[PDB]
Paper text:
Here, we further highlight the variability of the C2 domain putative lipid‐binding site in Notch ligands, by solving the crystal structures of N‐terminal fragments of both human Delta‐like4 and Jagged2. Here, we present the first structures of Jagged2 (N‐EGF2 and N‐[name]), which has only 58% sequence identity with human Jagged1 (N‐[name]), together with the longest known structure of a Delta‐like4 ligand (human Delta‐like4 N‐[name]). For example, the angle between EGF2 and [name] in our hDelta‐like4 structure is likely due to interactions with a neighbouring molecule in the crystal lattice. The loops are fully ordered in Delta‐like4, and mostly ordered in Delta‐like1 (Kershaw et al, 2015) despite the absence of calcium‐binding sites in the Delta family. Consistent with this, two of the key aspartate side‐chain calcium ligands conserved in Jagged1 and 2 are replaced with arginine and histidine residues (Arg‐55 and His‐123 in Delta‐like4). The Jagged1 and Jagged2 C2 domains bind calcium ions (shown in red), whereas Delta‐like4 and Delta‐like1 do not; the aspartates involved in calcium binding are not conserved in Delta‐like4 and Delta‐like1. Even between rat and human Delta‐like4, there are loop differences, suggesting that these regions are optimized for the different mammalian physiologies. There are also differences in the loops between strands 3 and 4 (CBR2), and strands 5 and 6 (CBR3) in the C2 domain between rat and human Delta‐like4 (C). A, B Delta‐like4 shows preferential binding to ganglioside‐rich liposomes compared to Jagged1 (A) whilst the converse is true for sphingomyelin‐rich liposomes (B).
Author numbering: 27 to 325
Amino acid sequence: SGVFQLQLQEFINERGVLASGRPCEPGCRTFFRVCLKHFQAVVSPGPCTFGTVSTPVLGTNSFAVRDDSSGGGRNPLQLPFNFTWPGTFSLIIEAWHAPGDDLRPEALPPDALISKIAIQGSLAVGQNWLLDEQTSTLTRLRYSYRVICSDNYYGDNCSRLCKKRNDHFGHYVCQPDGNLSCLPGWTGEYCQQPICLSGCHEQNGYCSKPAECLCRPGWQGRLCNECIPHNGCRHGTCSTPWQCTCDEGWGGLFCDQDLNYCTHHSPCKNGATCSNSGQRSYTCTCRPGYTGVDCELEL
Ligand SMILES: *[C@@H]1O[C@@H](C)[C@@H](O)[C@@H](O)[C@@H]1O
């Protein structure tokens, strides 16, 4: 399958005459009918096996085709086809005069024909336009053509569908041959599998988006490689999840029992000496001249 494209570039008709030799009135308002068919050795009537396409009026007498027009460089004529491109082809381009605004073949008399141009060709699929020119009796047509794949199709038979996407169902662009290429951060057959933050822990962390690391229960840190201590744990750490290994100077299952109230709180004042107590928290031994709970009162 594919699409035959045809550009019409320039048409010369300096006498402004029909194929009959009679002058167009008031000038040749020129449109084109295009018939594309399978190659045959001798030009003979028969159906247009690749189809027909027609243009509006593109100019009068002699003219260069504007880029906007159907047939111009930015809007070429297109004949799509579903079967195998046979390489060789016969192409018929008819220049017609429009005596009015009705371009249908039923409205036109047969002597409105300006010229009939037959082209025998052989072409491979590809992006390059082949330029050519045909001079009839008193007219001349410059045109160019090529065969390409319809949009998002690739391969010499245009059988490979690729269209880029960046959503929940895939993250990729299309290479020239129609094969996926993943956007950065993604892998998997259809570029749906995220690549986690480098270092993400293979058991304790995972990702759903590229370059993140989500932790499984009991783990923390950017790489999900650090255990979480027990929910009640105070002055304690862990090696594996939910432990509570007390810091130096603390005890209990939740590492909240102060094993050195004196150092951790420094209650005593005026240079007194602190000692721990299980009944009263601590005791301050005053220097000479001081009294009180914390030796804060001067004797
Ligand atoms: C503890 O006792 C008090 C009375 C002060 O003499 C301190 O210097 C000492 O460490």
